[PDB]
Amino acid sequence: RNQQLRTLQEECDRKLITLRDEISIDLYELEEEYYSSSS
Amino acid sequence: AKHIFLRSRAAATIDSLASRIEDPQIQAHWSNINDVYESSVKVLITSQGYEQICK
Amino acid sequence: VKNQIISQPFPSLQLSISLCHSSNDHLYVLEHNLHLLIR
Amino acid sequence: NTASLCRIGQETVQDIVYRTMEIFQLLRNMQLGTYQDRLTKLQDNLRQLSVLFRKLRLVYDKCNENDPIPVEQLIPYVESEERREIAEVNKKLKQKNQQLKQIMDQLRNLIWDINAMLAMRN
Amino acid sequence: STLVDELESSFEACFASLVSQDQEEIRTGVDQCIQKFLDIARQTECFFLQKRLQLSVQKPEQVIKEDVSELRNELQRKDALVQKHLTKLRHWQQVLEDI
Numbered sequence A: 001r002n003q004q005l006r007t008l009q010e011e012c013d014r015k016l017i018t019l020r021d022e023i024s025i026d027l028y029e030l031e032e033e034y035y036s037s038s039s
Numbered sequence B: 001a002k003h004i005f006l007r008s009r010a011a012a013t014i015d016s017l018a019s020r021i022e023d024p025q026i027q028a029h030w031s032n033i034n035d036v037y038e039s040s041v042k043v044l045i046t047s048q049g050y051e052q053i054c055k
Numbered sequence C: 001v002k003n004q005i006i007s008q009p010f011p012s013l014q015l016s017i018s019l020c021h022s023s024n025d026h027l028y029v030l031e032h033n034l035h036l037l038i039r
Numbered sequence D: 001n002t003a004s005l006c007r008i009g010q011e012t013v014q015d016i017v018y019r020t021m022e023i024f025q026l027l028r029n030m031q032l033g034t035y036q037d038r039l040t041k042l043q044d045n046l047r048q049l050s051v052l053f054r055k056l057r058l059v060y061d062k063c064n065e066n067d068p069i070p071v072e073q074l075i076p077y078v079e080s081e082e083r084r085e086i087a088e089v090n091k092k093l094k095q096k097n098q099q100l101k102q103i104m105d106q107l108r109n110l111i112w113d114i115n116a117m118l119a120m121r122n
Numbered sequence E: 001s002t003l004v005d006e007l008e009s010s011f012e013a014c015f016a017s018l019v020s021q022d023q024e025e026i027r028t029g030v031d032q033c034i035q036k037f038l039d040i041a042r043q044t045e046c047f048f049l050q051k052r053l054q055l056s057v058q059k060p061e062q063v064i065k066e067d068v069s070e071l072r073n074e075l076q077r078k079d080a081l082v083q084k085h086l087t088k089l090r091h092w093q094q095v096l097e098d099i
Helices: A002-036 B002-020 C029-038 D002-027 D034-064 D082-119 E003-016 E024-058 E061-089 E091-096
Strands: B027-030 B041-044 C004-010 C013-018
Touching (some): A002 B027, A002 E061, B002 D082, D002 E024, D002 E061, E061 E091
Antiparallel strands (some): B027 B041, C004 C013
């Protein structure tokens, strides 16, 4: 039961890593969209 | 707790800078990878039109 | 007092730590990390 | 309107100048089947160069079609309803900047939550 | 007057170093063409500095036309991203219920 749940732990780690990266990309895109305006 | 509070205080200072001073432009960027105690952030205050020259 | 660690780290800052014993505003990251600290 | 055309003329002059340095940058990469790609690339580059030359001649005639008033009126000596639209939309775009500012502040709180997750993940 | 012509005159002079049918001519030839070519270019800027400052001070309307023109083009690109952002916002919806 140890490695079986550790595989799910690492799968969720990869999922949260991808979500964090994708999100951060959206945040930087929004930031440079605001900077595209003269502000 | 001191690390979180000091990051919040730095955020408060940079938000005061952003809201008070919008003249050149304000840019704040943060490292995507961080330590538990120390961080590394980038602050840019560069003019409105010719930022690519004043490097 | 009984379950209340009232801490004053800074002269302009103070925080409460409570054993909420329900016997059935808040930051979760500290105790969520503390679980891994004791693990 | 004509000021926008003069700005377009200035930017097309910059376009030809950047075109000149990019031609000198591209041609200096080759000295003496890889040769065919570079020459086709430079042929497309000079085709676009000729198109840019003719279009700057066109916009130069377009900006030179109208000038009677000469220079030295330009030195600043010390001795209608579109303005309502400008005044009303300036504070709307400022309000939009603030409305996205609170949103990105909430995202800042989210990213300060998420950077501590990997900090003590192990 | 005819300032493009002496500008484009220096263009084929820039080819004089390149096209033909001991190094000292080459360093001079690639120089004085270019230094006069940056001469002939920076004055067009100051000529353009003259021409649109003429348009800046002789009339105030082409100033505010281009001021509206830059903010409308900012008004779209502001709106261009936010419901793009919103559609994107809808994207990590189903990305996150995968567990």
